[PDB]
Design a protein around this ligand. Structure first.
Ligand SMILES: [Mg+2]
Ligand SMILES: [Mg+2]
Ligand SMILES: [Mg+2]
Ligand SMILES: [Mg+2]
Ligand SMILES: [Mg+2]
Ligand SMILES: [Mg+2]
Ligand SMILES: [Mg+2]
Ligand SMILES: [Mg+2]
Lengths: 110, 58, 117
RNA sequence: GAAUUGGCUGUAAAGAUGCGGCCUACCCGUAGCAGGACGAAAAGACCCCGUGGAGCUUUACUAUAGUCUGGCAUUGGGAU
RNA sequence: GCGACUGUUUACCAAAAUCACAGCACUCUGCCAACACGAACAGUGGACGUAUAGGGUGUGACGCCUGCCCGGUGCCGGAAGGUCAAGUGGAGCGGUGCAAGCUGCGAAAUGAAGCCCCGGUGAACGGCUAAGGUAGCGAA
RNA sequence: UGAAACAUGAUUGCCCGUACCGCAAACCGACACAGGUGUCCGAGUGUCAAUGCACUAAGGCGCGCGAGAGAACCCUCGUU
RNA sequence: GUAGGGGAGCGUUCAGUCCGCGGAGAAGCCAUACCGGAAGGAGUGGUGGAGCCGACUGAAGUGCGGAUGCCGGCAUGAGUAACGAUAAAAGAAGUGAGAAUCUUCUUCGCCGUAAGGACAAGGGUUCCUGGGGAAGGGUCGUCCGCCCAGGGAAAGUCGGGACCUAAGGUGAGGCCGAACGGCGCAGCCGAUGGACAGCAGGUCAAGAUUCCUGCACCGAUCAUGUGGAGUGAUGGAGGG
RNA sequence: GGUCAAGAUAGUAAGGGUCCACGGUGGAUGCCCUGGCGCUGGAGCCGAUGAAGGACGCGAUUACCUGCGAAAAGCCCCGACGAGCUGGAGAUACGCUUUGACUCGGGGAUGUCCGAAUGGGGAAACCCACCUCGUAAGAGGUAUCCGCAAGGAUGGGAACUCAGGGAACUGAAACAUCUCAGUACCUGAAGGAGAAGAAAGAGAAUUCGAUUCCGUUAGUAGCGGCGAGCGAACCCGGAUCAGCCCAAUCAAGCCGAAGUGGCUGGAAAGCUACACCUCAGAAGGUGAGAGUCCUGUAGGCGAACGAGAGGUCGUUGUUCGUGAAACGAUGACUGAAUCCGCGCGGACCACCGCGCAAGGCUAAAUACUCCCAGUGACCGAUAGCGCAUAGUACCGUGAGGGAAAGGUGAAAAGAACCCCGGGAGGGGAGUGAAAGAGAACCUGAAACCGUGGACUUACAAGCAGUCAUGGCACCUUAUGCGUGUUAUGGCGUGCCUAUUGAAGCAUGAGCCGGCGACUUAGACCUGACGUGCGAGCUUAAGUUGAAAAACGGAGGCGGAGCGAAAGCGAGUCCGAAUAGGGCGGCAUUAGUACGUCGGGCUAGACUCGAAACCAGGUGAGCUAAGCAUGACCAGGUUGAAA
């Protein structure tokens, strides 16, 4: 069953960054990342939402209706943005934390 | 062996000319004089238990 | 490379299968049998043309003299007569003339006796 | 094999429900009988064939375990 | 009638007149026996026995019995002579070289068992030309 | 010199099996199969005797389709 | 016009190349009264939900009704024969969505050298409790030897082992063998046999010479006393 | 109207038939891949510091698998890596993570029990001992064979290598030789390769000069019941190329250019309009089709520290099957020399010639393929491996045999709540582009079951149709021809096989779907067609390049025939010269290489099927017997010897 390898269990972003859902529905919509599932290529960003009905049987006093939860996506959102529009990434270097490397587009932040 | 045995498969047709006699006869239900539900002539009304008075228990 | 028969056979079959219509039972629902029925089918088809020709002239000759004899002739005679008169030379439609136009048919009738004796 | 699966005579590769001629016969079932369907079952176990097979014979051919036998080693010393 | 008897047998068409049997007979076997299993001068069984024992074959309680034919085959014994293997034995023939020599072929006689040959043996094959059916029984 | 043996105290006691079916829907028979399975116990009354035969304790069970009907024919019986 | 020879072509996949086509929708499927001399081709509509026609050339696991062909699916026989020993069953009452078929009671009938009881082997949890209700149970099932979960099995002395040996197995060192290997004394393994310490009761839902209760026995190790001296083998004999 | 009579005729369908519609069943078909096959190349041993392959275990919950192993889904360390992780599992809880987890590389430490298994027993994973070190817990040793001693050996490897032993079917249309074969199988030893190897050689040139492999020579020499059939070597081309010694760069990994708008859509990477990158337009993914969104790619970087003697008898091998038959080899008897020495050059001799045996080790080119990567006019689920994974289920006492099985959607958003039902199931609602995708979820053929409708059917003899006509219905390629259905008439002996002859009471077959049979190879022979050269025409092995093909003449075919052969030659064999046979010239006349094809030959040879034969092993847990040790036979009767 192959699975999220075509890419390379590599999330071109962090579970905290902000991103624009390019492609698919919710195009351009933005939000902070929350779940970064690298293996499966799953991303949970406050953007897209869903109203799911919790299957809570003898779940101590059921009262289960329909929650509002976020439903994960793939590489259907382009990691990080600064010109307010999607943007590749390329010009790195280091900080006072040369113990690290950054990234940037036409501009140079993230 | 299985001695007598049939000479040929029988038509879907033939096989039906046959069954032209297996149709159930629906009961001839009557309507109980009291609780008015339908009943079987000469038997007790399963819904009220009557047969003029009440024979079977409720 | 492998090379199934796929779709190639279903079709060959539907072709025949669909030729059989009011073919009774199996003969119109089972390939093999339906098909096979169509070989005998060949036999009849082909031979029936070279043959309805035989059947039709018969219908014609039958009527041509149930009118011929309606006056006092009879095919045998009658025909040789119109013959005796190269003049006359229908034979084809003659029956019909004898079936629809009695007025006419009589004509040709007497015409022959008048070329006969 | 599929069936819209009669009787008598005849014909047919020589014992026909589907060929011929005549006759009989409204449609569908149930319980029963076993004459027919050269009914089932087993690619006949008889018979012939196959330069097929196999078991068994023997003074068929051939070889061989085994076995007797002469020479040669292990094998020597003393006499006629 | 058959078989003496108890017994045994064709698991899945034969229970029997089949087989076995006690009894009889022939013969083999001297003991690491004859005989048999085994690649094997290993081992072992016969037998931790030893010829009134063990092997093989046939016959089948008991009874009265059991004849005639050894030409043929076999088995035992005899055994002059005939034939017969390897080998021993080297003449005679031929090769090559100049030659010494080196090399092909090949007897006579001699040489084991066996085969031919002589006799024998039937509860050996077997027959009733090697003889021709003693008793007993007999369309069983 | 403080032995072996007895006694009176004490401490000590390992591993495996021990449920249930087990002449049977729990094992061998493809099936909760009319078969096959070794051993032991196996009551009473009556009948020479007995682990026979009849009835029956203890105990176990009526066998995992059922109801009617009362024909032909088939099976297993009774009388003639 | 049969065996056979010769000719021209249809179609299927794969490959190279050309023209392309497709989510307002490919292939495949399905319907059809069109087209071509045939093999066959097209148009239109429906289905479908993603790949795909046509043309030239190249390579083929390339074309099917037969083979008592192979695999799979579904029919006929037909609701037929059967429901597995002719030891029978009846009522009441209860549970339940639903019971001839489960539970309770009261009767009946069958076995009783057994169709009772205890083991062995073999099987494993099938045992007990509470649930279950697909499939299995030749029919129902609310029930089960079936499904799920939890629980249950207790030994110094009963069997076995830490003891013994039989057939047989194995076997240092030995005898043989083309290899692998074949035999073989002692020794060892090896029960079905030898040897050896306990009985009576109680009682979990489910264990019992195993746990408890009562009383007992065996070996071992130590202490105390007695004793007052030998103790006595992988060997002999007796015996088993 | 009526009544009476005589005529005629329709209507109802219990059930059936044909056609249509709609469904169920079932799984073909198409598309797809999480899975296979082949070839190329790479790589190529593991193990008493205890393997291979297993038993029992470890998890909060764990049955299967996975990884491990009581230090148990993991423990240290070095590196790499930067948000995540908390195995497959799709679940909850607990938690762990820059004093950088996790994951990937690379070394350590732990590693119960069995297994060569080796403390002893043992019917594998169990049962029992002993000695030593010792806190007891716990540690360790306790096997046989070589060696003072270190240290080596026992085991396991798909195929490949050598060796010891070595079939038969089958062919020869039977069969004993011979063939099939020294193949199959058994066994021993070994390695990554082996084997072989440095000349008492081959050859006829007084040449070559270890071994091995490919080409060729050649199907020539020759072997052969001279039958079937078997079949060399030298030379020459090429891979590769050494002889030496005794005794007297690949793995982790990091960096890595270039786009927007509008349109269609449920969603665009599609359309359209402008733009960019390009030593990276190989490829996969993203709600449909991707140079510029992601991963990558060309290209660059890139680690602590990790890899790279003679003979005689009996026989036999080489083409060598007894033949005139050498030489090699060896079981048995024998038994030499040594330079004015020894072996051989196919009996044998001389002469001529090549070489020096009885000691040894040796790269490299060669083989195979368990494992790995890449590729494929390979498959794509009755195909492909048996397995989209299982040697499992299942069958067998055992050796052994051995399955089938794929697909919701882009994403669970996997259906809250309500209706009928105990449930199963279903209907709504809601999600979704779609439920005309709902979890017994892509397409969904056919047989087969069913519901509804249309036209029909209850004096009829029927291979089931076909031709003709009428009736009824309908008319999207279709109202003017038809489509469907039907009544009556004529005519009419299923299909295949095998046959002199089949409806045949002769074979085969229940129905449908899918699977299912004249092929492949050899520098082989022979011919048709076509192409290139052409009196000449070609390469084979290999070589070097390869998102390509050139190089390579060793060799082969034309070019002279005739004859047993010497050999002669457009002539030549018969014969002593005159006749002829075969050949040239004939009036004329070429081929050869590659391809497609017809056919031949040798291989399993169109497919399927044998009874049987041979090899190695599995079985006395049934049954026939033996051996050791145990068990069992109510009750009654009779009445022997003594
Ligand atoms: Mg009958
Ligand atoms: Mg007798
Ligand atoms: Mg008797
Ligand atoms: Mg009854
Ligand atoms: Mg078929
Ligand atoms: Mg499919
Ligand atoms: Mg697999
Ligand atoms: Mg026949």
């Amino acid at each position: 069953p192959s699975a999220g390898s075509h890419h390379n269990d590599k999330l071109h972003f962090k579970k905290g960054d902000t991103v624009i859902v390019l492609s698919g529905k919710h195009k351009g919509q933005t939000g902070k990342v929350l779940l970064a599932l690298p293996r499966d290529q799953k991303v949970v960003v406050e953007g897209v939402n869903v109203i799911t009905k919790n299957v809570k049987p003898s779940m101590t006093n059921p009262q289960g209706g329909q929650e509002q939860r976020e439903l994960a996506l793939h590489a259907s959102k382009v990691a990080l943005v600064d010109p307010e529009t999607g943007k590749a990434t390329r010009v790195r270097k280091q900080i006072v934390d040369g113990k690290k490397v950054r990234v940037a587009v036409a501009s140079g932040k993230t | 062996a299985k001695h007598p045995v049939p000479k040929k498969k029988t038509s879907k047709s033939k096989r039906d000319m046959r069954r032209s006699h297996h149709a159930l006869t629906a009961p001839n239900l009557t309507e109980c004089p009291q609780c008015h539900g339908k009943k079987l002539s000469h038997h007790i009304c399963p819904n009220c238990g009557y047969y003029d008075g009440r024979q079977v228990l409720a | 490379p492998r090379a199934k028969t796929g779709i190639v056979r279903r079709r060959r079959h539907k072709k025949v299968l669909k030729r059989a219509k009011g073919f009774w039972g199996s003969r119109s629902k089972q390939y093999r049998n339906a098909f096979q029925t169509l070989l005998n089918a060949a036999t009849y088809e082909y031979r029936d043309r070279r043959n309805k020709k035989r059947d039709f002239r018969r219908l014609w000759i039958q009527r041509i003299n149930a009118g011929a004899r309606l006056h006092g002739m009879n095919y045998s005679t009658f025909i040789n007569g119109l013959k005796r008169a190269n003049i006359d030379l229908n034979r084809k439609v003659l029956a019909d003339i004898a079936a629809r136009e009695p007025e006419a048919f009589k004509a040709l009738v007497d015409a022959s006796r008048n070329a006969r004796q």
